[model samples]
Target: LCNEPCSSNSDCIGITLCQFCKEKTDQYGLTYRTCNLLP
Candidate 1:
């Protein structure tokens, strides 16, 4: 689910247990939520 747009853990699909859905801003100045792997 990494890099996938999401609103919550449920939106992360199968990898919700390993990934986290968080809000972030990219270098392009885009602000949105995405699924990122736990560090």
Candidate 2:
């Protein structure tokens, strides 16, 4: 994972991965803001 600013949730695509940041944090830690389906 990298520390970069994203325009939207769609910014993180592929590998079913998501973006985690302090802006959106969950109980675990940070929030998985995006979910991209792998091919």
Candidate 3:
């Protein structure tokens, strides 16, 4: 899903799926990488 932890795009399901891997911050302002679908 969107918030699933990932280190790279490859960590996501696939290029056609949730392919974007990017860093995000939680409510606590902690940064981490996760998988998400393209815009």
Candidate 4:
């Protein structure tokens, strides 16, 4: 998924499933992404 914030799994497309909220800080500063459930 793109580097952005998501509120729900529906916010993401494809085979990605929302499992947990993620926050990362690096060269891009702060960003949010969903932890998808694997099959």
Candidate 5:
């Protein structure tokens, strides 16, 4: 969750059956991490 911490993109999944975390970022000045979208 954007509400939680993620060590890797794999940590953020299940947005749907097919959607998954493509990468991560702190560009939003995140304290932990933000999940990037996959194609």
Candidate 6:
């Protein structure tokens, strides 16, 4: 599996993955946004 960014939720096709990072952030200033994938 892999992480993919969608223009919005209702995305993440092929896999029924949920979206995260609604009200969050990180030190690197990177949005902790990305669907969790089974690596």
Candidate 3 wrong stretches, greater than 4 Å: none
lDDT of 3 by residue, 1-39 (tens): 555888888888654478788887999999988887762
CA shift of 34, model 2, Å: 11
Better of 3 and 5 by TM-score: 3
Question: Which residue segments of model 1 deviate by more than 4 Å?
Answer: 15-18
| TM-score for candidate 3 | 0.72
Q: Is candidate 1 or candidate 6 better by lDDT?
A: 1
- Per-candidate clashes come to 0, 0, 0, 0, 0, 0
Instruction: Please report how far candidate 6 places residue 14 from its true position, in Å.
Output: 2.4
lDDT of predicted model 3: 0.76
Candidates ranked, most accurate by TM-score first: 3, 1, 5, 6, 2, 4
Candidate 6: residue pairs that collide: none
lDDT comparison, 3 vs 5, better candidate: 3
lDDT of each: 0.73, 0.44, 0.76, 0.49, 0.48, 0.48
State the weakest 10-residue window (summed lDDT) of model 2.
30-39
TM-scores of all candidate predictions against the true structure: 0.63, 0.29, 0.72, 0.29, 0.31, 0.30
Best model number under TM-score: 3
lDDT of 6: 0.48
TM-score of 5: 0.31
Query: In angstroms, what RMSD does candidate 5 have relative to the true structure?
Result: 4.7
- Which residue ranges in model 5 land beyond 4 Å of their true spot? 15-31, 34-39
Error of 5 at 38 (Å): 8.8
Best by lDDT: 3
Positional deviation of residue 25's Cα in model 2 after best superposition, in angstroms: 12
Which residue pairs in model 5 clash with each other? none
Name the 10 consecutive residues with the lowest summed lDDT in model 5.
Answer: 15-24
